[PDB]
């Protein structure tokens, strides 16, 4: 083992899927089997469950340069944005999407997802 | 909303987007990673070798591409410019799954054998 390899002190993950990291070094995990997104601040030993509600099998997470957090809420066929500070949840205006899976956000805030229903990449 | 003109994906999993808007996909059902530059009518199969159910992809600011080669229990990196694949020196990781890379180049993965997050500086 290298000293450069460490296990981060998340707690009780169940089939974790995608993860993301922000410029503060906080790590975000789509904890699919617990229907939640957890965040571990750099150096913390206590993870934080983020204030999304009503998730069903979240599979991917991304964080933009303003600190908004995006999750693919796969089995609700939607992508949810958690606005920084306010913690408002916004369902992004994708049309006719089923089982969004992976997610990434670019520097401009454009959201990209993979979809299993039809094997496509969709940009919003 | 637009569908990007990738061709022939089968069970795409993770994706990534670089500082120039190129999109990279872990095309898990085809054991390959596909890249599409912004606005292009051409996709590129990147020269990763020997992938087996790759699940996640990430790309750093200098264009290196990182992939969780899940069923080979390894994380691989395609060096920008040389296009040589290297295996990152993780030890005893099984079923690495999601991936992200921070601004320092540190690699973070989820893994499905024991449900952990592993960091490699």
From TrEMBL, chain B:
UniProt repeat feature NHL, residue ranges: 1-39, 40-81, 82-121
Cell compartment(s), UniProt: Cell membrane
Domain of life of the organism encoding this protein: Bacteria
Protein name: non-specific serine/threonine protein kinase
Organism: Mycobacterium tuberculosis
Gene: pknD_1
Included stretch of the parent chain: 501 to 621 of 664
């Amino acid at each position: 083992m290298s000293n450069n390899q460490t296990v981060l002190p998340f707690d009780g993950l169940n089939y974790p899927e995608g993860l993301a990291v922000d410029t503060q070094g906080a790590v975000y995990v789509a904890d699919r089997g617990n229907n939640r997104v957890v965040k571990l601040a750099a150096g913390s030993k206590t993870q934080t469950v983020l204030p999304f509600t009503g998730l069903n099998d979240p599979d991917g997470v991304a964080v933009d340069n303003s600190g908004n957090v995006y999750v693919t809420d796969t089995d609700n066929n939607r992508v949810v944005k958690l606005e920084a500070e306010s913690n408002n949840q916004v369902v992004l205006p994708f049309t006719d999407i089923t089982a969004p899976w992976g997610i990434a956000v670019d520097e401009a805030g454009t959201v990209y997802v993979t979809e299993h229903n039809t094997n496509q990449v969709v940009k919003l």
